[PDB]
Design a protein around this nucleic acid. Structure first.
Ligand SMILES: [Zn+2]
Lengths: 52, 190, 197, 138, 137, 172
RNA sequence: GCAGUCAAGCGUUCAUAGCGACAUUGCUUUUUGAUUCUUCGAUGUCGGCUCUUCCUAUCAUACCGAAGCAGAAUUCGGUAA
RNA sequence: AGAACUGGCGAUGCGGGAUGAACCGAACGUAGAGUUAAGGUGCCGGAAUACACGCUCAUCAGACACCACAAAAGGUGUUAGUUCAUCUAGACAGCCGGACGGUGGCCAUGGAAGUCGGAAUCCGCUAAGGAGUGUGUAACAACUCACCGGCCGAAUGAACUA
């Protein structure tokens, strides 16, 4: 019922992101470092894990 | 290392005019006019012809230098808005609940009105900024568009409409509903 | 060099101004300050606000009403800032304070008087551009001061009258600079110029 | 290796600046890879064409001043997407087959060089009616 | 109109051939001209007309003029004096409002109380004219 | 640790009956007096050879003025400096008029950017770059551009008095 | 007592979703010790009751981020006393 | 807690260390004048909001030995520097032109022509070109990259150090 085009389109906004292993923030997926001060603007990140 | 002089360049095409006085910018063209204040940056300008301006910094550090480019880019954005216009198309998304969307005016306020988002009884109301205008698409379904000369207002009310329909307490990876920006371009050149 | 010294709060820096006002009072000059709300403070609003809040929580825990008094209004802000720079527990210090006056906006008895400026305390002169800073009225009205909008109203009311006055005076000076040039081309003027006048 | 590949390029350039008495500096701007190839099979008769980095063209021709000193004046003409068509055939034949045949307008002839001489390629296309006004009116 | 409009800060540029005033030091009250640049804050100058020796300096002791002339980089002092004379820059400086106010206050310092009473009486007479002058009009 | 001068210091072991005419060593020292110069001379000579001030002698201390104290030059300086947890070598470029002014600015700059002190700094070499484009560093190159010009905005009037009557201007 | 770093390994796969060996840096003085500086011409020497306040290293509630979160539920984590 | 050497405090005021038995300076009859000490000169406070070179902006800055604490590990914040590498025989970045022929290479099928997928990575001319890194068509058409060349012209990347 819900189509893959808008699926990917929304994934840009909900899924296609990266995650700080410390600050837990929702980061642009291609970023190198966390934009957040509290984690020291560190580099230790990950991708937001994928669903099912 | 305190770069002694750096500069960026701005084209002014035909039919456009600009007025700068103490970092107070007027930019006029066919779409209309756009104004800005940049007194929070210390920088110099120079008309060299009616076709070009230089912006310049003398003896600036790195972060001081960085603002030159974005300021130039912002000016270019204003120019492109007052000439070509800006146009931001979104798309509605839903799998079970049809998102209901209308416009409604309280004393001429023009709040966008949203209903049935995930079946909620909640009606969401988002005001319409000045200088920005909206169109529901007919040729294609659920494609509503904003447009105007001010990218700031356009982009901001668009993202307002984005973040206002943000799901709570649910795994969005499954629950992808909302309104999401599909396209951004200009009014002109299609 | 004067009986009185009327000072504009605008464009200045708090601590700098306070130090100089302090020494001037303790040398015995009578001073008066206006437009305190237009003060500029180094560093951004958030830092300054946090510092005030830290100052604000500190109180005599068993009885708040005798502890430090957290005056919000810009005048009293500068007052405290300056009292920190004085032996106000002296009779001499108390005298020095009686020599002082501070106001928001600029009321009648001074608005028609000259008022001056202190280069060592000016933001643009002292504080480097490319740096952020803070406005005292914003901070005060944030942290509990009420009467800001009144200041706007009264100051605009004043400023119009001031503008009319200045332009009236300007036309008169233009008249002067017209009617005096004829004597500027005169033997007395030539002699005075030979003498350096 | 790559410098040897630059040397590999430089060699064929000297190979053709010396082996051939004439050459046509030709504008290879806009010429397709298919149009460049079809010029060879027609030029397989005499002419050989040599492309490369103009900076390597100039730096190659700059190195050839001990002997071949009159090749110095190609370097003002080593500009833009251009190339040499080294040939020994007469002027108007290779010039026409370059310019007229297998052209899509779109390769022209920038400069024709031979024995330390420079032709603007315009009088090179003079068919007739120029010598009669000189011989008769004289 | 179509004409784009801008003001740009017309600053006194630091350059060669740029003439300068000395604010501090033994050469206070003197003029000179730049030869060459060292950094943002350090230059090389000479004031041979003014009698300044060729030397480097920090720019805090100095103000630029609005004036300037033509000069190549690294000009030795002789050539410097030559071009200075050729451009007649001290002459031009003298026609400044600036230099005039300077020499004025120099006089005002140099005055004698007799001359000050003279100045007073002259001001008074000038004023008596000027009052009734600016009465009719 | 003051306004510096350049000395050449020549020094020698003490002559023995075994070895007379020992092997005169010279050095170019940046220092504010001959005393400090001799000290550092012996410092360095100790480091290189089995000699000290007690078994040695100084033959001559001569001040070296710049040959062209007005021609603006571009020096390259090879430096060795002790950090807190290490010691390092450096090459820095300085555009200035004299070697000694370059050295002054260098000590100030190393104290500023590395919190290094004179005791911690060894000066390996000071050498003039005769041709531009052998310069390696942009913060010097931006001053070697042709026909260089720039203004000095934000001129601040340091005021003689405490009070003024007119809000001054940064025009210049 | 508490918190960090590294990560061999668990976590079906996958070191780091959550855990985390071998080590390793620190914090706290609500443990208990160590000392014995003060007080032995005298500080009323458990616990409860009642009562006010302070802390936060948050159990709940507010708003949020992440998951091996489909939903429900639960966990990790944040600004927050 | 216990020892070695010295100097101190105790037995000792004074100037500074805000405060402080021991630290810094200095040891004392009563007074004056001058010069200093250690320490300090924005104001409290006497003394330059003196000069100069640079660094730093902290939603938890820092601010003086004794001394009233802090680390490990980190940071594409910033500064400066070291090594390595690409690059003036023209680099990078960015723009720009070609992005071909044998050739729609082989299987897969309603259609798959370099880009749904499965299997081979060959040759020509070439400055170079992948039997293609991708957009797009029902499939071609239509572009951009791999690779190469026009342009500018000297920069560009990485890893390290404090
Ligand atoms: Zn983070």
């Amino acid at each position: 019922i819900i189509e893959p085009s808008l699926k990917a389109l929304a994934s840009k906004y909900n899924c296609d992101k990266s995650v700080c292993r410390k600050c837990y923030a929702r980061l642009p997926p291609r970023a190198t470092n966390c934009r957040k001060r509290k984690c020291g603007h560190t580099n230790q990140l990950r991708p937001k894990k994928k669903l099912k | 290392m305190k770069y002694i002089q750096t500069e960026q360049q701005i084209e002014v095409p035909e039919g456009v005019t600009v007025s700068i006085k103490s970092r107070i910018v007027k930019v006029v063209g066919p779409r209309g006019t756009l104004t800005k204040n940049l007194k929070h940056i210390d920088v110099t300008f120079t008309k060299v012809n009616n076709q070009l301006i230089k912006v310049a910094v003398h003896n600036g550090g790195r972060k001081h230098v960085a603002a030159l480019r974005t300021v130039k880019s912002l000016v270019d954005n204003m120019i492109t808005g007052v000439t070509k216009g800006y146009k931001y198309k979104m798309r509605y998304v839903y799998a079970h609940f049809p998102i209901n969307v209308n416009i409604v005016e309280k004393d001429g306020a023009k709040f966008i009105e949203v209903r049935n988002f995930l079946g909620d009884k909640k009606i969401r109301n988002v005001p319409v900024r000045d200088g920005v205008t909206i169109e529901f698409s007919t040729n294609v379904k659920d494609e509503i568009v904003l447009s105007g000369n001010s990218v700031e207002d356009v982009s901001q009310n668009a993202a307002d409409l984005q973040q206002i329909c943000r799901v709570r307490n649910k795994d969005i990876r499954k629950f992808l509903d909302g309104i999401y920006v599909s396209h951004k371009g200009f009014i002109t050149e299609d | 060099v004067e009986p009185v010294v009327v000072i504009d709060g605008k464009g200045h820096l708090v601590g700098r101004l306070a130090s100089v006002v302090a020494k001037q009072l303790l040398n015995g000059q009578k001073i008066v300050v206006v437009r305190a709300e237009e003060l500029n403070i180094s560093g951004e609003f958030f830092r300054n606000k946090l510092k005030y809040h830290d100052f604000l929580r500190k109180a005599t825990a068993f009885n708040k009403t005798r502890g430090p008094f957290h005056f919000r209004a810009p005048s009293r802000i500068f007052y405290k800032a300056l009292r920190g720079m004085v032996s106000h527990k002296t009779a001499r210090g108390k005298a020095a304070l009686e020599r002082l006056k501070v106001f928001e906006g600029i009321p009648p008895p001074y608005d028609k008087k000259k008022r001056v400026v202190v280069p060592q305390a000016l933001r643009v002169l002292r504080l480097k551009p490319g740096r952020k800073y803070t406005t005292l009225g914003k901070l005060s009205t944030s942290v509990g001061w009420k009467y800001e909008d009144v200041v706007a109203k009264l100051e605009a009311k004043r400023k119009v009258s001031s503008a009319e006055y200045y332009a009236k005076k300007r036309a008169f000076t233009k008249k002067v600079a017209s009617a005096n040039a004829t004597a500027a081309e005169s033997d007395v003027a030539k002699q005075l110029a030979a003498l350096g006048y | 290796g790559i410098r040897e590949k630059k040397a590999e390029y430089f060699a064929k350039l000297r190979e053709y600046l010396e082996e051939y008495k004439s050459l046509f500096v030709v504008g290879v701007d806009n010429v397709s890879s298919q149009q460049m190839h079809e010029v060879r099979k027609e030029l397989r008769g005499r002419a050989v064409v040599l492309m490369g980095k103009n900076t390597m063209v100039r730096r190659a021709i700059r190195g050839f001043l001990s002997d071949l000193p009159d090749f110095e004046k190609l370097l003002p003409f080593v500009k833009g997407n251009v190339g040499f068509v080294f040939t020994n055939e007469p002027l108007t034949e290779i010039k026409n087959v370059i310019v007229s045949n297998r052209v899509a307008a779109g390769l022209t002839v920038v400069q024709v060089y031979d024995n330390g001489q420079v032709f603007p390629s315009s009088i090179l296309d003079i068919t007739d009616e120029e010598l009669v006004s000189h011989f008769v009116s004289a | 109109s179509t004409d784009s409009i801008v003001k740009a800060s017309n600053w006194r540029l630091v350059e060669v051939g740029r003439v300068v005033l000395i604010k501090k030091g033994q050469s206070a009250g003197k003029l000179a001209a730049i030869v060459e640049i060292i950094d943002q804050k350090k230059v090389l100058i000479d004031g041979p007309k003014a009698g300044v020796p060729r030397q480097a300096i920090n720019l805090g002791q100095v103000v630029l003029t609005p004036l300037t002339f033509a000069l190549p980089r690294g000009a030795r002092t002789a050539t410097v004096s030559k071009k200075w004379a050729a451009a007649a820059v001290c002459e031009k400086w003298a026609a400044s409002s600036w230099a005039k106010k300077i020499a004025q206050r120099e006089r005002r310092a140099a005055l004698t109380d007799f001359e000050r009473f003279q100045v007073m009486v002259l001001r008074k007479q000038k004023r008596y004219t000027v009052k009734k002058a600016l009465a009719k009009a | 640790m003051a306004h510096f001068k350049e000395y050449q210091v020549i020094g020698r072991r003490l002559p023995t009956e075994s070895v007379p005419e020992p092997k005169l060593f010279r050095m170019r020292i940046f220092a504010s007096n001959e005393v400090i110069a001799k000290s550092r001379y012996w410092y360095f000579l100790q480091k290189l050879h089995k000699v000290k001030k007690a078994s040695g002698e100084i033959v001559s201390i001569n001040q070296i003025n710049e040959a062209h104290p007005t021609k603006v030059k571009n020096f390259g300086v090879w430096v060795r400096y002790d950090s807190r947890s290490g010691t390092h070598n450096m090459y820095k470029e300085i555009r200035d008029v004299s070697r000694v002014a370059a050295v002054e600015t260098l000590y100030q700059d190393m104290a500023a950017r590395h919190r290094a002190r004179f005791r911690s700094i060894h000066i390996l070499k000071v050498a003039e770059i005769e041709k531009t484009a052998d310069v390696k560093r942009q913060y010097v190159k931006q001053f070697l551009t042709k026909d260089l010009k720039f203004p000095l905005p934000h001129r601040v009037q340091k005021s003689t008095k405490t009070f003024s009557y007119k809000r001054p201007s940064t025009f210049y």
